[PDB]
Design a protein around this ligand. Sequence first.
Ligand code: NAP
Ligand code: NAP
Ligand code: NAP
Ligand code: NAP
Ligand code: EV8
Lengths: 250, 249, 254, 239
Amino acid sequence: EAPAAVVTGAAKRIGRAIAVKLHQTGYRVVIHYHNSAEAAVSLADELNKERSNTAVVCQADLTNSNVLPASCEEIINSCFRAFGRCDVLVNNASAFYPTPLVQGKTVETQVAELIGTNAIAPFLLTMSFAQRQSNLSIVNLCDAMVDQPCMAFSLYNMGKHALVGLTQSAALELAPYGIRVNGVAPGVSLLPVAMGEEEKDKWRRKVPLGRREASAEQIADAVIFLVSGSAQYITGSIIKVDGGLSLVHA
Amino acid sequence: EAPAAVVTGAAKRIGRAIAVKLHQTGYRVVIHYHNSAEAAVSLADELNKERSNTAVVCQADLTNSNVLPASCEEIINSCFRAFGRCDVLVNNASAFYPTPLVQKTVETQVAELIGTNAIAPFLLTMSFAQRQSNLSIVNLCDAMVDQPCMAFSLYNMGKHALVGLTQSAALELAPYGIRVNGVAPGVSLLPVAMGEEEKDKWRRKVPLGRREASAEQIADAVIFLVSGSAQYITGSIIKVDGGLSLVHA
Amino acid sequence: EAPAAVVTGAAKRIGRAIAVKLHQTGYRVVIHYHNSAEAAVSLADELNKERSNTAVVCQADLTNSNVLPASCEEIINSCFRAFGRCDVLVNNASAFYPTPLVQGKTVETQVAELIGTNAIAPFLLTMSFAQRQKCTSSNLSIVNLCDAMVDQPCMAFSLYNMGKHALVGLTQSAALELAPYGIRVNGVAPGVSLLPVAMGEEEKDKWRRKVPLGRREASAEQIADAVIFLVSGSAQYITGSIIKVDGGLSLVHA
Amino acid sequence: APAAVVTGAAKRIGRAIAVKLHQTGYRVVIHYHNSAEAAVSLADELNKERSNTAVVCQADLTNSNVLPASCEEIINSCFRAFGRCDVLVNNASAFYPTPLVQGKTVETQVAELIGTNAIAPFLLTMSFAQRQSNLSIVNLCDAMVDQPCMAFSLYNMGKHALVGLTQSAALELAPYGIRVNGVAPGVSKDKWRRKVPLGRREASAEQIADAVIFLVSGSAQYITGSIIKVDGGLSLVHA
Ligand SMILES: NC(=O)c1ccc[n+]([C@@H]2O[C@H](COP(=O)([O-])OP(=O)(O)OC[C@H]3O[C@@H](n4cnc5c(N)ncnc54)[C@H](OP(=O)(O)O)[C@@H]3O)[C@@H](O)[C@H]2O)c1
Ligand SMILES: NC(=O)c1ccc[n+]([C@@H]2O[C@H](COP(=O)([O-])OP(=O)(O)OC[C@H]3O[C@@H](n4cnc5c(N)ncnc54)[C@H](OP(=O)(O)O)[C@@H]3O)[C@@H](O)[C@H]2O)c1
Ligand SMILES: NC(=O)c1ccc[n+]([C@@H]2O[C@H](COP(=O)([O-])OP(=O)(O)OC[C@H]3O[C@@H](n4cnc5c(N)ncnc54)[C@H](OP(=O)(O)O)[C@@H]3O)[C@@H](O)[C@H]2O)c1
Ligand SMILES: NC(=O)c1ccc[n+]([C@@H]2O[C@H](COP(=O)([O-])OP(=O)(O)OC[C@H]3O[C@@H](n4cnc5c(N)ncnc54)[C@H](OP(=O)(O)O)[C@@H]3O)[C@@H](O)[C@H]2O)c1
Ligand SMILES: COC(=O)C1CCN(C(=O)c2ccc(CNC(=O)c3ccc4nc(N)sc4c3)cc2)CC1
């Protein structure tokens, strides 16, 4: 019987590539999304055309609020209702924008979005995943540049640092239940389509390996390794997939 | 002419020892407290007895909420109200208790553990910088942040976030001449609720002297980081842990 | 045509498991050894019986000395002599024993063995590997066997620990410098895997009980699996990364 | 009065560290390899302030069969002159590129970069501990150790090895009451200055010395195994 995975933020870009590769590997998938319903649905239809009844969508805002714990419990529950099991959780969804310390969202909204998506929702999803429970594992999408932060991204960086701590804390606490918890830390991967090529090229030229950003598929390949039987003794580990970018001095 | 410092959670234990040592160094101090009103007022009385008009208390809950920004702004404002300047912020206040992943609401636990340990330091940092010699912020971090205690996920996430803030704010505020650094205790003053046998278990793990840090030993590192002897140091986190973080399982 | 790999210290234990797994993946292998001549030849025979002319042995002491550079050069040369190419280098060989700071080999012999095998030989083999290279198919990489407990060191193992820290530095320095040549450099960091043969069962079980995931050591094959991942096309954008394979051991406090 | 050994003390950071320890009340052994005139000039300056408080000690810190005996004699020079040795500062350092892809032989570069930067500190640490209050060792580390300079593999390996020695020695010597810590300068030319967050300028040697003074002081009595970056924020700046 086929295993099942939840991927958050799976409608586009990296989470889409993760959902596709997990599906190619034999997993049934819950495609979580927030705003991108048309893209989430189009991915589910493509996957179900490949193998019937192997993909469902689940909508939820992962912003921190009074209701976030119920939302995260519902994402996990949707995997059990669709597929009768939940073997893999991939915490991929992420808000990313600057929050300068010195001078139309209020700062508490920015806190709820950046700390909720990057850290609190992963924690609540992790709680719900474990409470509901073979090769069980969680993969958190971290950031290879977490210790050389972008200027004016403090709340984003705090959320990603918190996710490192969750990855380590959850690996230790869930090891007795046989649940592994690991991370994949991209450097620069898919850049914004709207970003000018001159700016994209500034970033690409910083990468030692190939002077080019990672494809979403290269990020997905590390996720596939971590959930596989080839990683059965790996927990608490964060694999950078960054072409050497984090090793480059200013 | 005397510089002024804010110390959060300064009524007792490590924050008290920091406020006392800054006051001894020449600083005027805002003693922030949440519940420990009698202890905060007693400390301000003791410091004012030594030099009049050099200490005030300021009450605030640093749990995350939609009014936490205004509370954090008010803490910094109280320093400018009392002393006309604010040269040093020490982010010391902290909630600490277990939050098991497998069986207060969980959103209250998030508000308290992430709010005190990370969001309030962030908002206090924003207010400190915006409201602006030798300006600096010192965050009390945790030397054991990468060897977490079992069932302390949300606490550990908050302290990891505080490392991120220390580094991000160091980078961003360097052009304003504000340095941002951390002091990471291992085991210092053990929780009041702790039994004697458990206290001794933790003392025996420490390589250097088989004992916990005094609060004054933690305060000494804070003093160094705010001093002119640390003027080229920013983004650094000094472990004051007697070697504890280097001991394997 | 099949790619070829050098594995150092490959006669037994983890290095043997890595050579076997690379062989099963389709590589031709140089089985480097120092003292374990019988075990090396027995392994090369087993692999040659599976597929003809796909394994050779290569003997070398990797202790530091003025001839270590020539010895490392000759290991790499042996892969090209046997197989016409050298696609992967796995730096696995390692000396491991205590060197207490406060009170038999001289201290300079201990330096030569612990820093030579764990750091200088990997450096020289990396130089010789890269120099011997100098388009749609190439997948060149180096994997260094590191140590997940490098920052929580064992009491009285200073020189061993300095060697493994040096190897982290080489991994990151070589990843940066060789990236322009298309050579990726990564590490695999066991926690406790195959316990030293010298150890009694009680002492082995003390270590087993510390591991969060399963309260047991990693099998040699589990270590080799991470090596296979890093040399594979599934790791084509990964360089300078060190993957812990430690069942959570490095996360456990005192 | 306590006594300190400072290696590579004739110039630059090591000189500033010797001056500041001397100003704090230490007697000092000024180690040198080639800079005898400069070492003696410093000893003359310190001894003019306080008589018989500064001596010099020649040694090559390149790894060789005789390095252990040389390192033992540096520590013994401290005990000879002053009757005690409270502080060891491992400051001496060789620094140059060793490209992996192509006139010292590579094994000479190993002996100099790994020997001066890591093996000499290890042997000096052994001799210091064997010969044994506020005892401590301070190792000059590198704040850029995990974002290495291109083509500096052997230098970087040596500085990584020095982080391992700092941590291993802190653990092993804690029971002896010997603390072991590091100070990691960043940059201590205008291209480099411009990337530094704090003031777009390099660290004075005196700023490095200030962190050493803190770590050997009674204000750091609970601190061991810690490496303090003194780099103006540079290590936090992305490429
Ligand atoms: N791209 C890179 O270079 C890079 C670099 C370092 C780390 N990473 C990490 O890798 C992961 C994937 O990166 P990516 O570039 O693919 O991410 P992305 O496009 O920025 O975001 C992924 C998805 O996150 C979901 N998300 C955002 N805010 C949300 C909210 N409030 N509630 C629920 N879901 C929300 C969105 O879903 P909808 O579209 O459905 O609203 C979005 O499509 C992220 O965790 C990111 O931090 C990426
Ligand atoms: N003690 C140790 O071993 C140790 C080890 C590692 C790190 N640290 C760090 O060092 C710092 C000081 O440690 P400590 O043991 O002295 O701390 P603590 O006694 O646990 O707490 C410090 C103070 O924080 C304040 N606080 C707690 N919740 C708050 C809230 N919701 N709003 C506002 N203030 C609140 C309390 O003030 P009131 O009393 O006024 O309510 C409390 O007295 C902390 O950041 C801690 O994480 C300590
Ligand atoms: N085993 C573990 O739990 C563990 C834990 C952490 C890290 N690691 C790392 O993983 C790697 C493999 O571990 P292992 O236990 O399989 O290693 P090991 O059995 O201790 O040693 C592997 C091989 O190293 C070779 N070697 C030793 N000194 C040498 C010298 N002077 N010249 C040339 N070769 C020399 C030996 O070859 P001959 O037998 O031919 O003489 C030996 O069989 C090592 O790098 C180790 O540091 C292992
Ligand atoms: N300058 C910086 O920006 C910077 C940055 C990062 C780290 N650091 C570290 O901080 C420390 C001091 O830096 P610095 O710039 O003042 O050092 P430096 O001038 O490069 O060298 C310090 C002294 O080391 C001695 N030395 C070199 N090779 C030796 C050998 N084979 N035997 C014995 N002594 C030898 C030399 O003494 P003689 O002159 O007597 O021959 C030299 O004057 C070093 O550990 C360095 O790696 C410095
Ligand atoms: C008779 O007992 C022995 O086997 C001796 C060697 C191992 N030993 C230990 O104290 C010790 C330290 C750490 C461990 C856990 N680490 C490993 O087993 C380990 C770690 C690194 C490593 N590198 C190699 N080349 S083999 C190797 C093994 C096990 C034993 C001293 C006594």
